[PDB]
Amino acid sequence: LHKEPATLIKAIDGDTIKLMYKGQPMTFRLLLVDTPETKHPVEKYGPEASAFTKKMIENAKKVEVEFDKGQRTDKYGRGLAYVYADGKMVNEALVRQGLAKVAYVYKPNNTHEQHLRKSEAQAKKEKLNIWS
Ligand SMILES: Cc1cn([C@H]2C[C@H](OP(=O)(O)O)[C@@H](COP(=O)(O)O)O2)c(=O)[nH]c1=O
Ligand SMILES: [Ca+2]
């Protein structure tokens, strides 16, 4: 895997972000995590998860996306990646706060699965947010 640059256009919620990627606007969806729902007919921690992601990505000097080894888009045309804000993975950062659960683990796009699971287990042990 490798990291590629991208530019924030707009944070939609905890796990979905509009980025300019190779000079094209695209919606990206965070691999291997689910933040609580706030759009579809809002769940506990959804607003919190959304605020966390917005803050973390708006404050970055540099945003990067890292696709995994399989599909690079989902059925909705959203890019599927690990997103990094100044070298810090947003997917991990949410899970580590108990603001997302490890989810949608679809092979072969599971390269950081164990890494994320370890962060979720610490968020659980610490009773944070979703685990409170
Ligand atoms: C994260 C992820 C989501 N999705 C799809 C699965 C879910 O489809 P369905 O809506 O048909 O269940 C939806 C979950 O995304 P959200 O959590 O944004 O709703 O997006 C993928 O297909 N692959 C992925 O890697
Ligand atoms: Ca979600």
From Swiss-Prot:
Spans annotated as Disordered: 112-132
Biased composition (Basic and acidic residues): 112-128
Residues annotated to bind Ca(2+): 15, 34-35
Residues annotated as catalytic: 29, 37, 78
Compartments in which it is found: Secreted
Protein's name in the database: Nuclease A
Organism from which the protein derives: Staphylococcus aureus
Parent sequence residues shown: 89 to 223 of 231
